[PDB]
Amino acid sequence: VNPTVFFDIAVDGEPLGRVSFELFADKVPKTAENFRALSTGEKGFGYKGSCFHRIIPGFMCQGGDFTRHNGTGGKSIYGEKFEDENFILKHTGPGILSMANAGPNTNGSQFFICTAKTEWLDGKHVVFGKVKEGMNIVEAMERFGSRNGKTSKKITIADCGQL
Ligand SMILES: CO[C@@H]1CC/C=C/c2cccc(c2)COC(=O)[C@@H]2CCCN(N2)C(=O)[C@H](Cc2cccc(O)c2)NC(=O)[C@H](C(C)C)NC(=O)[C@@H]1C
Incomplete structure (x- = not known):
């Protein structure tokens, strides 16, 4: 019954690969539903075309600002x-x-994908899903990150939806 959604990731507009997520609606249904609907675009806004604005290798990849496109929205x-x-x-x-x-x-809509155990975030950030397929694509994304999180290429969600 848990939904699965996907992101097709691009690097400076060229296809990189697909990351698929299980959303844990059984434990955090409101949070899972938000992410699911933003992935399909069914409310008329959402993740499609937005970028990963902060990628810190060995920590996490953060994205989801589709309103300001500057990390604040x-x-x-x-x-x-x-x-x-x-x-x-x-x-x-x-x-x-x-x-x-x-x-x-x-x-709001911003989210992050961990690439390591980050227990100091426990009780501060709501966990609501996990990568199901395409962790090798997340690992490839890290190569375009940096210590302070600025990306060296534009890393975008070229397409997304529900499986
Ligand atoms: C631009 O926005 C401002 C943030 C300023 C810069 C934060 C910053 C810069 C470099 C490295 C790191 C954080 C390392 O930590 C992460 O990468 C963490 C990892 C978990 C996800 N995450 N960022 C977030 O959820 C961070 C957590 C955070 C906030 C403030 C300072 C800080 O050190 C970490 N929050 C945000 O990004 C929110 C945004 C969702 C609307 N923005 C805000 O609070 C501000 C209005």
């Missing part, structure tokens, strides 16, 4: 921001999909 399907649903799941290792935020109860 994005919005949820629930208006603007929404509350932290729960912190049942933890940042246990590579592939974990979690909500970016600016403190408590500020979930």
Whole structure:
């Protein structure tokens, strides 16, 4: 019953590969549904065409700002921001999909994909999914990141949707 969604990733407009995610709707249904609907674009806005604006090798890849395209924006399907649903799941290792935020109860659309166990984020960021297929594509994305997170090529979600 857990949905699966995909991102087709491009590097300076050339196809890199597809990352697929399981969304844990069984444990964080509101948060999973936000990400699912933003991936299909069914509300008329969402992840398609947006970029990964911060990639820090050995840490995580962050994206999801489709409103300002400068790291500060994005919005949820629930208006603007929404509350932290729960912190049942933890940042246990590579592939974990979690909500970016600016403190408590500020979930919008920005998210990050962990490439390592990041337990200092537990209880601060809502974990809601995991990479299902295409972790090798996330590893390739890291090669375009840097210590401070600026990317050396434009890393975009060329297409996305639900499987
Ligand atoms: C541009 O926005 C501002 C952020 C300023 C810069 C943060 C920064 C720069 C370089 C490396 C790192 C963080 C390392 O940590 C991450 O990479 C973490 C990893 C988990 C996901 N994540 N970033 C986030 O969720 C970060 C967590 C954060 C905020 C503030 C400072 C900080 O050190 C880390 N939050 C944000 O990016 C939110 C955004 C979702 C609307 N923006 C904001 O709070 C501000 C308005």
